[PDB]
Every structure is written in C-alpha cells, then in structure tokens.
Subunit: 143 residues, 6 copies
C-alpha cells in the first residue's frame, strides 16, 4: 500500500498498469508518456523519485534494438539493485511463453526511498509482470 507512478515509453499500457496497480493496493498518481530517449526517460524517473512516490513502473524500452534505452536510463538512478525482481519477471515471463518478458533488459532497484521497476512493453508482459511484481513491491515498500 502506497502510492505509484506509471511511465510509458513510446500504448494501452497506462490504463492497464493503473488497474493492476490498483488491485495490488496502490494509488496511481498518474501516467507519464515519454519517448525512447535515455534523457527523457531518466528525467521522468528522477522527477518521480524526488516527488516521493513509493513505486515507479516503466513499461517498454527493454528489448535489444538501439532505440531500447530504458535500462541504461534507469541504471544512473539506482542506489541499490533488486535482481530478485528482474529474475522473477523474466522467469515468470518464459514459463508463460512471453518472450519479450523472458528476454527483458529491465532493471529493478531502489532510488532514494522509491522502488523502480522496468517492465517490458507487450500486453502479456504487463499482465504477467504486475501479477508477479505486486506482492514483491508490497513487501519492499514495507522496508
């Protein structure tokens, strides 16, 4: 229980992430859409951390093509990394047969007091990714 922001990298994801975040027990302060620009994405994350949200979910920008800069945007902001979250989403993704989730370069970790998690872009990856993530997020905001 806390409050959370969504960041779509340009999607149908924003309303859906809002919904699943809602069911996980989160107030969704809003949806911010940004381009696959490392600076535009980093600016959006940093701004959110400073603003004191408990949780920031990004969606998209985690595949292999050079336009996919979500991870490297994110890494500058992380005080500590939570591979546990990255591994659980990827593991879960493959199991379900969702490959962009299986192969995601998304990070997870803590910036200030905020948990940041990068989820992959496809609808399947958002569903499976929130299902898995929501519990783990809850436990971490608990510190």
């Amino acid at each position: 229980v806390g409050r959370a922001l969504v960041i779509v990298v340009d999607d149908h994801s924003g309303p859906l992430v809002t919904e699943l975040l809602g069911e996980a027990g989160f107030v969704v302060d809003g949806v911010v859409v940004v381009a696959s620009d490392e600076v535009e994405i980093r600016n959006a994350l940093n701004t959110a951390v400073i603003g004191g949200v408990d949780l920031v979910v990004s969606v998209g920008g985690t595949g292999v093509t050079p336009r996919d800069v979500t991870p490297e945007a994110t890494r500058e902001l992380l005080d500590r990394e939570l591979l546990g979250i990255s591994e659980a989403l990827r593991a879960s993704g493959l199991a379900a047969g969702i490959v962009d989730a299986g192969l995601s370069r998304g990070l997870a970790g803590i910036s200030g007091s905020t948990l940041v998690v990068n989820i992959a872009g496809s609808r399947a990856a958002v569903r499976d990714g929130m299902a898995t993530l929501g519990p783990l997020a809850v436990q971490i905001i608990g510190q």
Copy 2:
C-alpha cells in the same frame, strides 16, 4: 478468430450480487482470440454446475471455462460436477495452472482441485475463484487452449 467460448461462474453470492469474474474472463479470453458466447451464473451446487456444463458442451462452443468451487470446503464441488463429462483428462492443463499459480503465490490456484479435458470436441477447464487466480490461469490457459482447439 480462434473460437467461442462459454463461461460459467460458480458462486453462491453471484447466484445475485454483482459478477466480477465473468467480465474479466471475457476480456482475457478476448485477448487470446476467443469470443465469449455467454456467461452463465450458477450456485455451488453439483447438479446446477453439471447441467450448465452439459448445456455448454451441447451448444456451439470450442471452450468452456468454469470459475470457482475448486477448493476444499463441503460446497466446492465443481470438479465432481465436471468429471463424468470428460472423455479424456488433460493433466498438463490442471498442472500448468496449479504450478503457475503456486509460483505466483496464489494458494487457491496452486491447490485447485480443478480438472481439464475434452468433452467430445470441446475443451473444458475449471479455474479457481480468486481474482488473482482468474488473472493467472487465463494468462496460462489462453495459448494452451489456442493449440488444443486447433488440433481438433
């Protein structure tokens, strides 16, 4: 597209407070490429479920999906209602589901007594009632059903 489906919501309160499962199953079956022909609500009652099921198979459907009544209490009797209808168990479905659920921490999906099988030419699958379990089972079921209804 892929096919048609009928959704049975096994719940006493729903049979008549508001159905949440039924819309949700429909939304998710839609993304997998199914049209839901209908949502039938029914009490945790062995016969009522068996009839609902039997009627769906009889009717023009490729996929039947029950939600609820898969637990352990006296009144969870969806598996009992479902067994005679099967011609051939699909244990990999029950297992894929039970395992996905457990992996995700959803003990009612994880511990579901729910079955899976062909009843004639129709895929029947029982799913557990919790929202988490509907969301996970469907994510797991959709591709599996897509490939079973194709080999038929």
Copy 3:
C-alpha cells in the same frame, strides 16, 4: 496454534533402531505453527499403515503426515494404504512437493508416489523417506497445510 498433527513414520528398521525422521518432522511442523500430538512408527506393510492412518483420522487431528514407503520397490506401499480413505485427492500438494524435490535434486521426493488429500476434515499427506525429502517436503507443505486447515 494453527492446528494439530499426528506423524506416521513408515520404516521397517525403525519399527523393528532409533527414529530420526519423527523428531525432525515435529520441529519443522512446529515452525509452521502445528503441535504434534504423537509419532506412530509402523513397518512397510499396507495393513499397518492404513490402521495407523485411520486411527489418526479417528483421533480427530487436523493433519496426518506419513514419512516413508513412497518409492517403487515392492514393499513401498504407503500410497495404496492411503488411497482408500481419501474423500478428495489434493494433487496440487503432491505436485508441489515432487516439483520442489525435483528442483532440489532430491530424486526420491521428485518421484514419490505419495498421495495428498482430505479424509473427513483431516488433511493427509504422504512424504518420501530421505532426510532431504523430509526437510524439503515440510518447507513446501507447511504453508499449504496452514491454508487448507482454514476450513
């Protein structure tokens, strides 16, 4: 106190040598919130196992965990001593255990033919006999048995 438990240890040696599995099951069960009322040692004989199991369900206990006699040899007869008194099979417990065991490298847990199920209002689970299988089974069983006792 989440509920009470009886332990049945299925081992010839023990029946005819000191019991290692039973104190262990009890430690592990008591971490998951259970109190073990007793350990009952029996031999790998269909009849003995079944009588002990029925006497447990007749003791009214919340959980009965057998240990041993789930393998393939002709004397591993725990599963068939147990089937007759289940009103409902709980495959997802049996599947969870074998899956967990298999992933830990514990082949006897991995391939156990041990059943799980409800007998009246009593949860009944059969676990393989190695110390490894006992330790991994109870970790995996503890939570599931807590929730099922919700009933």
Copy 4:
C-alpha cells in the same frame, strides 16, 4: 552401465517411410547409459501399441519408451494403450516431462497425455512425438537410472 531399453515408435506414416525418432531415442538412451535392444515401429492403434508394450515387459527389458500418440486427436491412443499394463503409476515422471517441455515452450510435450509407471519390473514411459519433445523428454527422463536402481 545401467540397463536395457526398447523403443516403440508410434506413427502411422512410419508404420506404412524412414523412422526419424528411433535412431534419436537410441542415441540419447545410449548417453543415459542404456543398451537399446532395438526399435519397434507401430501404427497409431490402441491394440497394436498395447501388444508391443506387452511383448516388451514379458521380454524382460528394463525400460520401454514410446514416442507419439499422446495428443488430443482421435488416433492419439497411446495412453489408452498403456494404462492396462501398469501396476504402479509414476505421475512424477509424466509431471516432470510436461513441466520441462512447457517450460521450454514445447506444447505437445507440455500437454502430452503420456503415462509413466512400472509394469512387472519394467519402467514404461510414453513421450510425445515432435522432435523437440523427444530431446527435452529424454534429457529429463536419469529419472530412468534412479528407478531401475530399484
């Protein structure tokens, strides 16, 4: 090393065309430490399959592996063929294979209705028919060596 095995290929095409699975199964059974007595081929028929399984249990072999006939189509009768012959079901084998195949994205392994168990003193295991399913099935099946150990 470990024991002797016989391979039954279930495939109409092959029973009427070069067998693809038989040599592969033999190959992998070898790496797992089995001598293969050889490959019986068999049309996708309940009774014909059943008798080849019978023949093999009676014929003394430690492991019988079936390939194919595990799907949902009507001619997929290998499970029906196999069940009257088991004295003891080993669901944890069926379970492991299914779980492994589905984990690897192999849907005919993942959903296979193939059975596994002990008939007399023989380990019998039905594996699904696709090439991917054979490789994953056999790499998972080690469980074989354990079980023949007793």
Copy 5:
C-alpha cells in the same frame, strides 16, 4: 567427507547453519557474529578466506534497509561471481513463498579458492538456502 566451512552471522542461525552444512558434508570450524557494519563483515570474510576454508556462508543483511550492507561488504572480495547460485537461491526462495530469500541482494562467488555465499536472515531462508546451496557447494569444492 568434503570440506570445511565457516558461518558469519550478521546481527539463532549459527547452530542451524552448522547442522545443515553437517548434513551437506561439511565440517564447521567456527561461527562468527558480526554487527551489520560493512567493515566488520568484510573483515570476518577476509579472515575466513585467508585461513583457506572451503566455504563461507553469511547469514543476514541482504534486504533493502540502510543497515543491510552484506552485499557491499562481499563484492570487492569476489574474484569471480557465481550468479547461478544466487539465482538458484532466489528462485527457490520465491517458489517456496520466502520473499526475503526471493529478493535477497546476497552475492555468491570465489575469493582465493574459497566459495563465499550470502544467505538472507529468516529461518525459512536459511533452510531453503542451505538445502539448495549444499550440492552446489559440494560440486564447486570438487573443481577447486
């Protein structure tokens, strides 16, 4: 049978880690207790490595809180990292419902010829971790 181990507890777990390493095939030379202080931990690990023990298991200090510094303390000691061990423990943890193991920032790796492994603090994590780690440790101690 197989090798010598040292337990570092970051402040219950000591006797338990001892018991389970035992069953895994490991003599336990000692149990060192340490106070959640990057410096203290790194030194206990230094000492453990320098004395040539085969396996060092640390317990605790792997969560997200300010004073969870066990990973920071271990990183510079690792010659080679072994994510497969960390992955196996985290995945095992998660499957078993044990979130502290599931989300543990704990590392695994080789320092000198010593296998070092950070396990999370909860009793369940120690049990799940040790059951998983045991055979992995045995195999690595073989190839070293």
Copy 6:
C-alpha cells in the same frame, strides 16, 4: 534460414590435438533450430585466443555465435572474461534461462555456468557450458530465444 551461426569450441585438449565431439553436436542442434552453420572454430582455454575468435566472428557478420566450454570456476575458465570485453549489451535473461533449465534437469555445470549472453555489434553471442548434457539443454532452450532476437535485429 533464420540466420548464420558460428560455433566456438573452447577446450585445451581439443585445441591440442583431440577429436572435437562438441562442435558437430552444436552444428546439428543449430541446424534444427533454423540456422545455417558457417563452420566450427576450435580454441584453447585462453582469454586472448577466445576474445580474438569471437571478435573475428562478429566482424564477419554471423547472426549467432555459440561458444562451448570455459564457463566453470577453475583459473582456466575464461570464456566469460573474454566475452565481456566484446558485449555492447547483455541479455541476462538468456543466461538466467539456461542456468534455470540446467539446474532443473540436474546438470550442475549448466546450473553454475558463468556464461554471458549479449549483443556484439549485431551479433547474438552466447556462452554455453561444455558438458554434453549442457550443450543439449542449452541449445534446446536457446534456439527459440535466438530466433526472436535475430528478428528484433532486422
């Protein structure tokens, strides 16, 4: 054709004379996964030599390089260190899947492999462990993942 693949076999004994049992098998399995195999390069378990073979294979433009061996934990196992120099981006997900699949199947060298996966230039590079069991399990898990990576890169 999904693409071209190259096999690098990292094994001192193979390098110093002995028959290569790993290289043909990876050729077959890549065949089935959908790849034409440009050939097999054998290398000793030396970081330079290995780095040089990967670097040459990348610049030559194959879609996929699989290496075999040198992922363990002896001093000699330097495939990861060689590979790391060359990666523009890591696909931790591929390594996680191979380790996870290995462990489940009881194949501990796959389980514990320090293998990397990643993108070098426009080449998918993946280190697999050297055991015969690890090569079979590795290629099975990898084949489809690599199909989907080549396609995102074209």
